[PDB]
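Rotation project, supervised by the postdoc (A.L.). Task for the rotation student: set up a whole-complex structure prediction and record inputs and outputs verbatim in this book. Inputs entered:
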Amino acid sequence: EQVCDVFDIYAICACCKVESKNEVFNNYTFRGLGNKGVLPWKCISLDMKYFRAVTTYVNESKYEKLKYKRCKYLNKETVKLQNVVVMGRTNWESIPKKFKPLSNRINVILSRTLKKEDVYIINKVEDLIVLLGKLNYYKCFILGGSVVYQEFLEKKLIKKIYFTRINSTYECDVFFPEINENEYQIISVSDVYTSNNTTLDFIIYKKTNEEEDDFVYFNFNKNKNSIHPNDFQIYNSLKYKYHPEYQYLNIIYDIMMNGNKQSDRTGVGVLSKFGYIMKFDLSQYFPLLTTKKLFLRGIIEELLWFIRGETNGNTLLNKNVRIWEANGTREFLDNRKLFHREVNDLGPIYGFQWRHFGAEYTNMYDNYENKGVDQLKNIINLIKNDPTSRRILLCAWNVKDLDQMALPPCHILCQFYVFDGKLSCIMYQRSCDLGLGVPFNIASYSIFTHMIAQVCNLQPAQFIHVLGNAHVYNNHIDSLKIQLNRIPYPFPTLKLNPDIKNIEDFTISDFTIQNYVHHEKISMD
Amino acid sequence: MEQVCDVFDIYAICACCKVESNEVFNNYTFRGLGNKGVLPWKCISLDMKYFRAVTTYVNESKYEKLKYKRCKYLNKEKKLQNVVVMGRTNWESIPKKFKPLSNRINVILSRTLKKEDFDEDVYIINKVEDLIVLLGKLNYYKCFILGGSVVYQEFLEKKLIKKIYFTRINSTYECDVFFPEINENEYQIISVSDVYTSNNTTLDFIIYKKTNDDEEEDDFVYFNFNKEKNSIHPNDFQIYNSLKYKYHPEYQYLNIIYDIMMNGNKQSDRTGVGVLSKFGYIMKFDLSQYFPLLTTKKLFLRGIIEELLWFIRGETNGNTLLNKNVRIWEANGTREFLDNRKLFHREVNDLGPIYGFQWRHFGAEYTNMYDNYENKGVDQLKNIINLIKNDPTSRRILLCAWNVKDLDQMALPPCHILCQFYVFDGKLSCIMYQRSCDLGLGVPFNIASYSIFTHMIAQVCNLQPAQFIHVLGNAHVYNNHIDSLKIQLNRIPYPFPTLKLNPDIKNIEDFTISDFTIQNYVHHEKISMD
Ligand SMILES: NC(=O)C1=CN([C@@H]2O[C@H](COP(=O)(O)OP(=O)(O)OC[C@H]3O[C@@H](n4cnc5c(N)ncnc54)[C@H](OP(=O)(O)O)[C@@H]3O)[C@@H](O)[C@H]2O)C=CC1
Ligand SMILES: NC(=O)C1=CN([C@@H]2O[C@H](COP(=O)(O)OP(=O)(O)OC[C@H]3O[C@@H](n4cnc5c(N)ncnc54)[C@H](OP(=O)(O)O)[C@@H]3O)[C@@H](O)[C@H]2O)C=CC1
Ligand SMILES: CCc1nc(N)nc(N)c1Cc1ccc(-c2cccc(C(=O)O)c2)cc1
Ligand SMILES: CCc1nc(N)nc(N)c1Cc1ccc(-c2cccc(C(=O)O)c2)cc1
Ligand SMILES: O=c1ccn([C@H]2C[C@H](O)[C@@H](COP(=O)(O)O)O2)c(=O)[nH]1
Ligand SMILES: O=c1ccn([C@H]2C[C@H](O)[C@@H](COP(=O)(O)O)O2)c(=O)[nH]1
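Outputs recorded:
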């Protein structure tokens, strides 16, 4: 039996990224504890709420078990419930005097120079175990600061680390100890949030080493595809996985465990399932996958191209955007029976349908001004003017034009929904390459949602991704296995040049991704 | 004090069907126990498998507390097995190869027979109280009363049953003995299961209840640090919220009514009624195990079938359905409605290029509801039927009603935007995306509509229907529907019915109304949403 287990000693810290000088990222990217005696940031209220809630929660119906445990360990039969909060000397000097001692906690100050003549002064870290051994308390929290964190980690006196990850960069003079991946492992991860203009997320480090019957009866009638889940050891060792990235990752997991084995065109073979939904809060984060690197320049130039209504593949290629290069080749168009189609003339695809649905497509150079239905203009007008309409849809799936398209759209339709100055978007995708396409598709429609929201004097809220035929290609399985056993970072944010007030005026400079913390790039094959 | 059935954990388990007699259905509908000494049905596997799993399942860990419980009650200090108790007739209805029931302590209630007339490892008792005695003298996990009708009768009468695990068999058979009429004041339902199909009958399993790492639970509390309505008091959902396990597929529907009521957004709309709305749901239905015709209100299927048939023919003529006395599209076709749609040159009940037209003639210039459109536009339905037969792994099997160019010419723009099909292992599944969803009125029918259509497509392509998947876009509840939905959300579903299609129909155009049969629909009372 261990001191940190008997006496229930945990740390709790909030670390931010630190100023420096291709950047590399690890857990130790978040290590900024303070600057000039004070916190590195000016105020992040959501972490304070977390901290204040965590260090004051107790469950009295569980103390009799802890009290009993602590007594037997010390060879005793004896010792309103409160936690204990242990702080360093400077850390105690840090707090204003109106917030000292901390409300409803047993304040304990570690110091060699104090003792005014209740708040307890302990001269050595060993006096804590002695002081806890004669106290009535639920759990004991090490509030730091920098030195106190170091010694308590050294002496293995830490059971769990409650680690706020503040996803922004500050000037600091003090830093958290480099957590030792042997000593501790991340067991849980929280939702991502935005507070005071920064994203943050909350993780837990763990020290390493009747209706019950009724439920069983209902399961009476309840791996499959040569996947050994011990390859997902880290993925299956997390108790709580609240991070929104797990929506994507769990879908990868489910297809791999349960997918139906199917041939397809390329001859690779997929595992597929049918019908999924993901939701992302665009007002808290920008869902750019952090468990591998993703680039957005080509994604944005594809969307700007869409907005112009161009079908000319050469515009993308002269910008070195090659998303569509393979769909415009002589061979690809000839395989689509498009023998009278100029190379890279992709025909009536997304941009055309969004701005001229119904118009007779002739070639990518033709002048289509005012031919067809300006779907994009229509939905923007409806958002500004008839916001509760249920008819605000952007449809790319023109049944008459499919065969003339270099290929039919994967992204069938966007539906929009407006409430309380908030705009939500649904995109229905008929075919989803979970390994290669879906990460990009999530970012495209999120950016597009922000773009639509800003030109309609609204705030972005939810991006909803509906997957139809959803498939992992077999040659991706090994790469996704590596990716399932990485743990997400807090998401980045997207910034739009505020001065763009109409959907056609966005340019590549008007887009800025802030604080993108990611794992290493993974070539999916 | 304490009650006997809790210390000694006495349960009843039974299986009941419908018996021979605009009918009324209550719980007493399912009451048929046996006929001519035997069970009324031939062999319903999944119920026996369920029966076996419940009566043989023990959990060793819980027995320490169990022995304490019965010790303190009596004022006292081979694997664990359950007790099963049967009446004499019940015991003689069992094939000898299966007697006594494996891994179980068999207790037989009898007056005319003695331990001498039995070869088998079995206890005989002549009166009920002696089971209580015997229970005190044995080591067992739980005690299950198997029947028959007399054994069920007197155990229910003497308040000796703590939980009734009750199989509702949703077919009719000839019977001569019956489970007692359960007393609602004495017992109430607490858990409904999934619906299953087994040996050509749908069934589920329901439970009655008698009426009157340890610090990582803290990690759960910490992560719920940043959480916390409309004018809905949850005491109006006493039955709904009291239910322990709600695994009946219909709770996928009912749970969305609840989510939109408790959480939705108050918005206006065209009608002036205003609604509560949410954005983006998905329901899945296993058409291989049941046909999801809602059971918490009565629904009719004749109109909607006629509609789907009208669709497949390509029709846009509102008179065709009105002469079948089907009024689904009548209001969207009045002179007044069409005028307010600024379709001044459209004849009354000519609905324009709507679903039927877009499915057979997408892109064709619409003229009037009487034109011959043959081989004009793109015949979507045929194209998907040939995709399913010949290119079953295509990810392009899509049916689309949302023809952006024709929207203004439609009486209404379509609510059901698209159907996507998926084929694996000879099983057809269907996604339909609905942009606007009226949970009180439309959605119950729209689930029925596209379930049937999946069946029809699956059949004409020689596949078995599997999964119908409903993606809801703008999902709303009208305020003038809330009070009826409150009643409905506190009704407990019945096992789903089934759909039979005539097997001789090999192409999608040949179906007629009489090729569709909906069987064993058990349902609550009709509900006017207004
Ligand atoms: N972001 C976060 O989660 C946290 C941020 N902070 C920030 O971190 C900084 C404070 O940490 P820091 O500045 O490193 O000062 P500390 O809070 O670490 O306290 C350091 C002092 O603790 C005493 N001490 C250390 N070890 C012992 C020991 N073994 N026995 C007795 N006394 C001991 C010494 O004072 P003596 O002279 O008495 O020996 C030492 O000077 C501030 O900038 C603050 O804002 C504070 C807490 C956590
Ligand atoms: N579908 C289902 O869930 C079930 C179906 N069944 C069906 O039910 C029918 C049998 O039930 P049933 O017909 O009611 O016959 P029972 O199983 O009720 O047997 C009745 C007999 O049990 C004995 N008995 C009953 N109560 C007592 C008592 N208090 N003290 C002593 N002996 C007692 C007597 O045997 P004696 O003549 O020796 O006095 C009596 O004649 C069959 O058709 C069977 O298949 C059976 C169980 C459940
Ligand atoms: C919030 C930064 C932080 N976050 C986490 N996770 N671990 C930490 N060690 C800290 C540092 C910290 C600084 C001040 C207080 C404080 C001050 C006044 C009053 C109170 C109070 O709770 O009343 C608290 C607390 C913590
Ligand atoms: C099956 C109808 C039924 N269903 C439920 N839910 N409760 C019940 N009381 C019964 C009645 C019953 C009839 C026969 C056996 C039996 C026969 C042979 C072997 C076995 C065995 O388990 O080996 C069981 C059991 C029960
Ligand atoms: O933006 C895109 C474009 C394509 N795909 C993938 C999904 C399928 O693997 C393939 C779509 O073509 P079909 O197999 O459905 O014809 O490309 C995506 O995931 N996202
Ligand atoms: O099959 C149908 C047809 C109509 N509606 C309802 C949903 C809306 O309340 C109304 C159409 O809404 P609009 O988007 O047209 O306003 O009809 C359905 O739920 N199902």
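Student's summary: Chain B touches chain A through 73 residues (CB under 8 Å).
Supervisor addendum: The CA atoms of residues 217 and 223 of chain B lie 10 Å apart.
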